[PDB]
Amino acid sequence: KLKLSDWFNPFKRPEVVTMTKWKAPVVWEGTYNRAVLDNYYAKQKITVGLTVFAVGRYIEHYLEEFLTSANKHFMVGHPVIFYIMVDDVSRMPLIELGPLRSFKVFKIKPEKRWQDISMMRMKTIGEHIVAHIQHEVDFLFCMDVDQVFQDKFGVETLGESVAQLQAWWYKADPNDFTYERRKESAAYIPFGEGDFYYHAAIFGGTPTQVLNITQECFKGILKDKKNDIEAQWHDESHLNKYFLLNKPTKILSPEYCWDYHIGLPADIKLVKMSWQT
């Protein structure tokens, strides 16, 4: 069962849009009940996966912190599989993992740019979802290495299709959103429409959802290529158009991916995960 009412109570957070026009929740510190959710999901033998790519120098100075922090804050108390797509392998750090954590590594072909590093990422993720991830996990999360888990990034984050709110553009409104306005691009979003500006550093859902996500972002990135057009913010733009045309069932708040470069407004009480510098 489990109704939105069982774990989420908006009236707990300082009027900062906890619901959306499609009745979806926006998880903010103090509006979720981990306690309940943990039990609910444990009783279901739920296991969560996390894909992370690291090519070139990134692996050298980001991967370790990512993995070390994730192993300490991500879905603690629940079966987690880390899928590490790397270009080298002979270089990646084997950090010790704790209870309910395990992983597998994958050697991925580098290309350097975005029309690659970021284009293939979408193709690769789907290829893997269909190949094995769908059979190994109940909920999948795709993220960027250059991030760092700061505190419990628990199961209140789960959902059929989860989206992150870009830390910067969340106060702003649709017409200031850096969508792709060149109507010649597939990630094109007019100037009237627009719900939120989602971050490409975090997005998840069920394997099936993520598959459709990556798949659509890829076929679109691929299309812009055969069109000599490169959407600004590459993957982020296509994603943003997908989430506009396929509303997420759950939006996380800037607290789940915060940029400390912005400081720390009272709107942000507990930082689950920040940007790496």
Swiss-Prot record:
Name listed for the protein in its UniProt record: N-acetyllactosaminide alpha-1,3-galactosyltransferase
Gene of this entry: GGTA1
Note on domains (UniProt): The conserved DXD motif is involved in cofactor binding. The manganese ion interacts with the beta-phosphate group of UDP and may also have a role in catalysis.
Residues bearing attached sugar chains per UniProt: 212
Residues of the full protein shown: 82 to 358 of 368
Lineage: Eukaryota, Metazoa, Chordata, Craniata, Vertebrata
Disulfide-bonded cysteines: none
Protein keywords: Glycoprotein, Glycosyltransferase, Golgi apparatus, Manganese, Membrane, Metal-binding, Signal-anchor, Transferase, Transmembrane, Transmembrane helix
Cofactor(s) this protein requires: Mn(2+)
Reactions catalysed: a beta-D-galactosyl-(1->4)-N-acetyl-beta-D-glucosaminyl derivative + UDP-alpha-D-galactose = an alpha-D-galactosyl-(1->3)-beta-D-galactosyl-(1->4)-N-acetyl-beta-D-glucosaminyl derivative + UDP + H(+)
Residues binding substrate: 53-58, 144-146, 166-169, 178
Positions annotated as active site in the UniProt record: 236
GO biological process terms, semicolon-separated: carbohydrate metabolic process; lipid glycosylation; protein glycosylation
Similarity comment: family membership: Belongs to the glycosyltransferase 6 family.
Group of enzyme by EC: transferase
Task performed by this protein: Synthesizes the galactose-alpha(1,3)-galactose group by catalyzing the transfer of a galactose residue, with an alpha-1,3 linkage, on terminal lactosaminide (Gal-beta-1,4-GlcNAc-R) disaccharide borne by a glycoprotein or a glycolipid. Preferentially glycosylates proteins, can synthesize galactose-alpha(1,3)-galactose on glycoproteins but cannot synthesize the glycolipid called isoglobotrihexosylceramide or isogloboside 3 (iGb3).
GO function terms (MF aspect): glycosyltransferase activity; metal ion binding; N-acetyllactosaminide 3-alpha-galactosyltransferase activity
Cofactor annotation remark: Binds 1 Mn(2+) ion per subunit.
GO cellular component: Golgi apparatus; Golgi cisterna; Golgi cisterna membrane; vesicle
Residues exposed to the Lumenal side: 1-277
Pathway: Protein modification; protein glycosylation
Residues that coordinate or bind Mn(2+): 144, 146
Entry's localization field: Golgi apparatus, Golgi stack membrane
Membrane topology: Single-pass type II membrane protein
EC number: 2.4.1.87
